[PDB]
Design a protein around this ligand. Structure first.
Ligand SMILES: Nc1ncnc2c1ncn2[C@@H]1O[C@@H]2CO[P@](=O)(S)O[C@@H]3[C@H](O)[C@@H](CO[P@](=O)(S)O[C@H]2[C@H]1O)O[C@H]3n1cnc2c(N)ncnc21
Ligand SMILES: Nc1ncnc2c1ncn2[C@@H]1O[C@@H]2CO[P@](=O)(S)O[C@@H]3[C@H](O)[C@@H](CO[P@](=O)(S)O[C@H]2[C@H]1O)O[C@H]3n1cnc2c(N)ncnc21
Length: 400
């Protein structure tokens, strides 16, 4: 029986790999590990010299990985996604200079640019009749794997009282285990662009760019997702500015990346109801949430007292919880009439245009070759950037 051997030995393996590839307990505790006494980096060295290299290499490896993940049929990039993860946690545990953490953020941007490999792999592997049952079970393993990794990272730090250095050796036990799991993945018999079983993409783009909702939510995915990424990369440097007490027990970075995933699974679930119902007022639905993001970025830049670090965590859970609400709606309005050969090209070029904006703002605001702002004055620039973006869509919606 090959059909009963598929759901037992393959679909139970994609939901086991997709669970175990998201297990990185020290992923929420990289920046408290760098700024702690273990590596002993100064804040001025992480916000201006290490973290802007994350948004530079992510421009450099976005298009090389996206072309390679379809040409190699998604398995050696899923092998690379896991192996570059190990190269991050090796440089975190063996590197001591600033140049050994700039290389750490270069391998970390490969693991961000190969996030699409996994999901774009379940589509090319399973049959389209059984695709909704497999990818529904697979994304319920990634979202479970993202949530319970930050819980496992938090309970070892808060409850287990394990140190930050010994946490990354636990994180090297799951990342070396998920490289071996990426070896035994079934390579798909097709792909999306190169390896097909047998251009119109330039012709159907001439018909889909004239849509009002594809024009709107693509200009949201370029600019609002650029400002979203510049908060998540720098909110752990801001929490270490508010409460810089090196204790490895009062830091709840894993409890703010698990509660943001749990809220990111609630508002995502609540966005599927409003997906096609609120498509008319989507130009005002952006400005109601971008302004809410404009206040929560300012709330991060307003809290200075270390006794209110708990109010900061909640200003970031409600930030990711509000960004996750628009994306269910964003992925819909964009991918409504697009073919799969054109949908992965529109999202593949919206992410590149978002990484163009992420490269511009990091070189202007965050990098030492531009202004070189600290992370307290940097979030005041992003709160202006979200409020500038909020009054564009609010004035844009009122024109209707
Ligand atoms: N269909 C796909 N093709 C190619 N790559 C994909 C992909 N669906 C996911 N991913 C990748 O997995 C990552 C984590 O996904 P999640 O943890 S399973 O959920 C994400 C995350 O919570 C947030 C930031 O997402 P993001 O920065 S783009 O990161 C995603 C993305 O890189 O938005 C959610 N999200 C993204 N897309 C959708 C969607 N279509 N419907 C409902 N929720 C969505
Ligand atoms: N974060 C991202 N970066 C780059 N491209 C992205 C992207 N998130 C989405 N897409 C694109 O949007 C297309 C349509 O997505 P949707 O219409 S919004 O929903 C899809 C679709 O119904 C099904 C197969 O379609 P698929 O091959 S994924 O095609 C996706 C994908 O190409 O999987 C659903 N889906 C995708 N991600 C999630 C998720 N995180 N949680 C729940 N459902 C999800």
């Amino acid at each position: 029986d090959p059909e009963l051997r598929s759901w037992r030995h393959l679909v139970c393996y994609l939901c086991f790999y997709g669970f175990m590839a998201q297990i990185r307990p020290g992923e929420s505790f990289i920046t408290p590990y760098l700024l702690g006494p273990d590596k002993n980096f100064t804040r001025e060295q992480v916000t201006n010299e290490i973290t802007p290299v994350l948004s530079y290499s992510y421009l450099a490896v976005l298009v090389p990985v996206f072309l390679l993940t379809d040409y190699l049929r998604y398995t050696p990039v899923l092998l690379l996604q896991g192996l570059s993860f190990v190269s991050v946690w090796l440089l975190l545990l063996l590197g001591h200079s600033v140049a050994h953490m700039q290389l750490m953020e270069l391998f970390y941007s490969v693991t961000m640019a190969a996030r699409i490999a996994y999901s774009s792999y379940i589509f090319s592997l399973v049959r389209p009749a059984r695709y909704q049952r497999v990818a529904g079970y697979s994304r319920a393993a990634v979202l479970l794997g993202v949530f319970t990794s930050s819980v496992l990272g938090q309970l070892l730090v808060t409850v287990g009282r394990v140190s930050f250095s010994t946490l990354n050796y636990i994180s090297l036990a799951f990342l070396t285990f998920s490289v071996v799991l990426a070896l035994f993945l079934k390579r798909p018999k097709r792909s999306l662009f190169f390896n097909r079983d047998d251009a119109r993409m330039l012709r159907e783009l001439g018909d889909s760019l004239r849509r009002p909702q594809l024009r709107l939510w693509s200009l949201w995915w370029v600019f609002n997702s650029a400002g979203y990424y510049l908060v998540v990369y720098y909110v752990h440097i801001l929490w270490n500015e508010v409460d810089p007490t090196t204790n490895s027990a009062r830091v709840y970075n894993g409890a703010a990346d698990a509660a943001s995933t749990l809220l990111g699974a609630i508002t995502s679930f609540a966005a599927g109801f409003v997906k096609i119902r609120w498509a008319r007022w989507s130009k005002l639905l952006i400005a109601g949430v971008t302004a809410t993001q404009a206040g929560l970025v300012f709330l991060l830049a307003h809290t200075r007292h270390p006794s209110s670090i708990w109010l900061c965590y909640a200003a970031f859970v409600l930030f990711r919880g509000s960004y996750q609400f628009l994306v269910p709606i964003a992925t819909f309005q964009i991918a409504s009439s697009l073919s799969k050969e054109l949908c992965a090209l529109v999202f593949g070029v919206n992410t590149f245009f978002a990484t163009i904006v992420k490269t511009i703002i990091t070189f202007i605001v965050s990098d030492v070759r531009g202004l070189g702002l600290p992370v307290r004055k940097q979030f005041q620039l992003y709160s202006v950037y979200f409020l500038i973006l909020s009054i564009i869509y609010f004035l844009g919606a009122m024109l209707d």
